[model samples]
Target chain A: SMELSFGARAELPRIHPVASKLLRLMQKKETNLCLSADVSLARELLQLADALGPSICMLKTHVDILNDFTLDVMKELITLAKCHEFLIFEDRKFADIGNTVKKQYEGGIFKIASWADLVNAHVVPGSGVVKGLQEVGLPLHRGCLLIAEMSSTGSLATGDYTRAAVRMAEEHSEFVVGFISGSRVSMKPEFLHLTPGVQLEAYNSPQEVIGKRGSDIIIVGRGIISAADRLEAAEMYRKAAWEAYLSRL
Target chain B: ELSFGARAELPRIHPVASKLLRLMQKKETNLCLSADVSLARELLQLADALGPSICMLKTHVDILNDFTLDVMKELITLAKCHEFLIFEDRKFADIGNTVKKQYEGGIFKIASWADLVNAHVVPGSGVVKGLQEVGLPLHRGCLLIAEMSSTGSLATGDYTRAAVRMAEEHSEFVVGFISGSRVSMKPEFLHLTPGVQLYNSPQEVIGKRGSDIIIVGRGIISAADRLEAAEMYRKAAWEAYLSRL
Candidate 1:
């Protein structure tokens, strides 16, 4: 009998196609970790991607915060993303009416749809927001990670809100990949849970608790990037995450 | 009487916002043109040609592919020269700390220039809390999105009322709302409405007192003649304002 750990679970098929592809890539590469690459300089980002790309599954960005930001900077980053076999998760957190967010996504200086494989959004504006972003992302094979709950110290995404977000995502599952959730999700955890606030000590714990059949993945910004040796830090987490997945199997 | 819909109420608003309301009365126009275009120069051009006819120029500053401080400087200078205000529609929604970073340190530094801005009350009060931390020091007035005009939007009934209540409580930072209805707000706070077309559909005629600023986007900008389209809305809005007297 195939254990409930790896694949072929009733829940595994519920992950969006884009997220499923990302999961397959992670499983093939044997790494469930990603770099929350939150730096300002254009060169530093590309050099890091070139050096540590093999060990990580994804790279997260807050593009507007960069001082020397340009459309070209993102153009180059997209090139490196392909060569390194890593996906790009832009933390745009778009919150607006569908028409405006569509303009923000498709027609802005960032033109987020041009490069990002996945984007983040808030449920503040509701179903229309998911619909708007889908018009931009669906044509290009992209997805969104709804903020079911946030890991910050005083985030407002509570049970009722997360439940509503899950319902929105379930209804619009074609575009929504998963969630940036707190520990407990109300809507049966059908989507991938991209958990932030991961430390070295917690990697084994998440997969152990989640048990791999499309389990949550740990996202560490400073825990790995701020380390003295970047690749080794990411490698350590990847190995631990893989072993944790194997343990569940 | 502190009726916000009347021209006599202009000076009683925020000192900077006072200039906007005062200019609208002086020019006999309460229309804010949303230059939701794709370029910095094009937006500035719209502001330049139509500067005298309107009270404010609303912007999506980050949309410009060639966005820079020089273009922003010119827009501010134009606003000062024309005696209008720059309302940057950032719609910032995040934790207090993150929203602070977004408003202050991000490449645009929205507080340094914009007179008015809007935000989502989504992250509960944290977004408002964050904007107040950065915006209050700079005298920036935050417009809460109490309700939206989109067909399938979720900011309805209870949520919309909650946003209005939030604004009423946080008057230090929140001046008013980007709203369709003003049921919950004090008449003193500014109500900027977006869908102020040449004529409302018949369904929209069911009586209620209307918005403070009639915000027209493509209705004014995408016209065959920008100046003429703007002047028409600007004249009608003033006429509408005077009829209440």
Candidate 2:
């Protein structure tokens, strides 16, 4: 029997009969939820992801932040993912041309493409950039999350031209992983909404910051990791995110 | 002057450094070889096979994309098991503050793990902050980037002279200086030169080759016969050093 790739099944899992019916009414793509483990404590986070693998679809990592990381740790991570059944998304936030990107991919200290299941590449340099990356052995599973809009304070990822960038992303068979918007913008049926800057508790939201906005994945950075109790905070954020998703439905 | 013992250990060069040191202490002529393979797997294999023969094994970590903590741990353990040291070609350059952050923060926490880390001090950031960041005990070797092998570069004689001045000030940590000069002239500094292709002579190549100093990358690694090339480099380096003295 032929097995489907994770990228194919990513959308299939979330396509509920009622949600699918409502998805037609709404301008959002099929959801494939991801949890960005952007914490200082990498081993702890990986363990948590391991425990909650059934509840989560993908676990994103910023491996550079870890104090203690080696080949053994990476092998353990790969083993954990295999056992628990989840994908690894490395949020490198790559923003460079093909030559530099290639150098960074192969030349830099942290060789990203080695074990990463999904990696984020900013399409700031234009569509030709994507073609260059495609030329490498980085397959569809080695997914590219083009930064349409950034969920930061005073971001320039908005206005009329943002929509056109989204179209370009769609045309390249690249996933339109939502515009990092303040308000949940109506997404197309084929595009996935990846909302960063999500804050569950009052403390989770930074002092001088607004909250996250989107449908599927709510990336809670400080909210989950910097909390007094990480597991409890993660659960709270997860519940809040699920509630938010249900409300949108 | 902090000695190599007090300095950060080059785990990559662990096998060779340890063996050579031991052999040299016993007054033995040790033969050493090196390689420049960009992949970790090949490097590991080379280290395993030539653990006894080689005196040092150097690497450019940036070349290997699959560099993970696991690989690092394995390499360190292998070196330790075989009694070797690791030399990382980091060539770190930036502001003192940024360099501090880089050493401690994120994934490549070199200060905590690396035996000897290579730093490029181009901006004149004092070694005090760097020393403080890695703890006073840690051995921090400053690579002045005093000269370049590649043509059309601005690493001229005057620039190198000034760099040497700054390096002399921090000589406690500055174990060696890189030069691409044909003559084995030790100007109050230990010399290390790259672009040392042993298979071809100075006439065949287009750059200066140091006599008595450490010639990295090209000589041993890129040569067709690694072991033979290493012997040639060792002989050349010895001759150059003796001639200079």
Q: Name the candidate that leads on DockQ.
A: 1
Candidate 2 docking class = incorrect
Quote the lDDT for A73 in model 1.
87
Residue pairs whose backbone atoms clash in candidate 1? none
Give candidate 2 regions above 4 Å deviation. A1-109, A112-249, B1-35, B51-54, B68-85, B126-128, B182-188, B199-212, B222-225
lDDT value, candidate 1, whole model: 0.73
Provide TM-scores for the models.
Answer: 0.84, 0.46
- Candidate 1 per-residue lDDT over residues B53-160, each given as its tens digit: 888889887677777778888999999888788899888876544577778765787788888889876667778888888988898888988777765555666667
| Sequence-dependent TM-score of model 2 | 0.46
List ranges where model 1 is wrong by over 4 Å. Answer: A1-16, A47-55, A151-164, A183-190, A198-215, A223-226, A229-249, B1-13, B199-207, B243-245
DockQ values of all predictions: 0.40, 0.13
How well is each residue in A220-249 modelled by candidate 2, as lDDT tens digits?
543433334655655555555555454434
lDDT of candidates 1 onward, in order? 0.73, 0.48
